[PDB]
Amino acid sequence: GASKLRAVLEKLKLSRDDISTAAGMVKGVVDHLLLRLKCDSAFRGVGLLNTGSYYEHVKISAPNEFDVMFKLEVPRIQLEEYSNTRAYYFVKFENPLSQFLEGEILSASKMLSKFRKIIKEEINDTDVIMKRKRGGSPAVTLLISEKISVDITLALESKSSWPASTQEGLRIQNWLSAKVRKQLRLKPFYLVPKHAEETWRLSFSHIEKEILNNHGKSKTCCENKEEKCCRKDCLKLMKYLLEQLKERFKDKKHLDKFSSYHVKTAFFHVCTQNPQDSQWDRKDLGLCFDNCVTYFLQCLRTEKLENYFIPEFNLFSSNLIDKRSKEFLTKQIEYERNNEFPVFD
Numbered sequence: 001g002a003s004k005l006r007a008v009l010e011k012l013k014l015s016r017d018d019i020s021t022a023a024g025m026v027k028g029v030v031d032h033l034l035l036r037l038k039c040d041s042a043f044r045g046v047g048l049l050n051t052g053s054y055y056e057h058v059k060i061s062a063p064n065e066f067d068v069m070f071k072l073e074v075p076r077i078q079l080e081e082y083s084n085t086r087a088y089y090f091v092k093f094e095n096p097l098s099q100f101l102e103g104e105i106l107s108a109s110k111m112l113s114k115f116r117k118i119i120k121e122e123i124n125d126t127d128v129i130m131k132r133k134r135g136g137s138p139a140v141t142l143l144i145s146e147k148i149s150v151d152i153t154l155a156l157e158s159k160s161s162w163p164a165s166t167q168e169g170l171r172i173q174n175w176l177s178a179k180v181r182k183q184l185r186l187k188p189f190y191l192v193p194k195h196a197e198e199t200w201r202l203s204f205s206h207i208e209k210e211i212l213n214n215h216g217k218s219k220t221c222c223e224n225k226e227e228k229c230c231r232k233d234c235l236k237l238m239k240y241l242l243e244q245l246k247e248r249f250k251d252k253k254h255l256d257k258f259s260s261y262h263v264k265t266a267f268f269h270v271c272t273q274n275p276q277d278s279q280w281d282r283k284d285l286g287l288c289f290d291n292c293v294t295y296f297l298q299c300l301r302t303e304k305l306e307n308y309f310i311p312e313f314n315l316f317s318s319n320l321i322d323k324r325s326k327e328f329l330t331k332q333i334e335y336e337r338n339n340e341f342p343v344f345d
């Protein structure tokens with residue numbers, strides 16, 4: 001444990017907890033968008049994923065940045081792995097999405113261009129302007145007033161068994177048990193637009209809250225005084241460590257490809273590595289956060305960070321992130337641990 005780390009966590013808790021109208025402004029915009037979308041022939045079956053919450057945030061230090069998902073149920077889906085990528089698929093199949101068919105394969109580009117057209121129109125009809133940024137996921141980014149920012153992703157939902165590329169993924173059997181792994185694999189999966197082309201990426205982002213809210217080997221982890229663990233605290237600190245380094249070097253482009261997602265992935269790989277709750281004692285926050293920082297550094301150096309669900313998908317391959325960018329971050333983190341983590345004060 002370290003006192004500095006707890007002070008950072010106390011600051012992050014107060015920004016998250018204090019009175020804010022922001023969620024209300026976002027709910028207003030989202031509820032309005034959903035109504036204009038449910039009238040469209042193609043987006044009629046659109047539903048907000050997790051209709052009840054605090055809307056989900058991409059940043060632990062930014063209370064004004066929101067992350068939202070609109071899902072479309074896609075029964076009787078045929079998936080085809082593109083170029084042996086393990087995570088990117090062609091979507092094959094009347095139905096409402098038959099309009100976006102280009103032969104047999106579903107067009108994401110055309111679906112996103114339509115989704116954008118409808119949102120861009122609703123923006124004019126409280127001031128909400130669509131941020132100029134263009135990319136498949138998030139499909140849309142809105143700036144509400146001056147401070148509030150909302151990412152909106154359009155995703156396809158499938159209730160069929162997870163694709164074969166996931167068979168060895170979610171290696172939680174020595175931590176959460178074989179019984180829990182089997183229960184989670186019965187949950188749906190998502191397909192989001194992203195190029196490896198008219199390819200969709202497999203997404204399991206919805207599995208995170210399931211694990212975070214029931215994260216111990218003991219069924220009573222964090223339910224009493226005797227069983228207080230630091231797993232959630234280590235993830236918040238790992239995320240905050242990346243966010244602060246990204247902010248510091250925003251004028252350069254060396255940390256542009258790194259995201260909270262990479263930090264989450266490496267963190268859950270440490271959970272598999274250290275499955276016992278005794279390896280996560282609240283008193284050992286310092287050493288636990290150190291095990292996290294060390295593992296992430298090893299990922300950067302070896303250029304290896306497997307998708308937690310798709311083991312043959314390396315998020316740190318040279319083709320996705322060049323070595324110079326990795327070596328830059330490796331140098332910045334190594335500086336932070338050798339200087340009592342200055343980004344935290």
Ligand SMILES: Cc1ccc(-c2cc(C(=O)O)c3[nH]c(CN4CCN(Cc5ccccc5)CC4)nc3c2)c(Cl)c1
Pocket residue numbers: 049050055056067068069153202203204205206207208209211261264265268308309
């Ligand atoms: C044990 C475990 C479980 C889950 C994950 C996981 C996996 C994925 C994945 O893609 O498989 C993730 N992706 C991202 C970033 N996304 C940005 C866009 N958001 C849209 C949204 C917004 C609101 C409501 C739904 C959706 C969701 C969060 N964190 C992810 C985390 C990991 Cl690592 C380990």
Ligand SMILES: [Zn+2]
Pocket residue numbers: 215216221222227228229230231
């Ligand atoms: Zn716990």
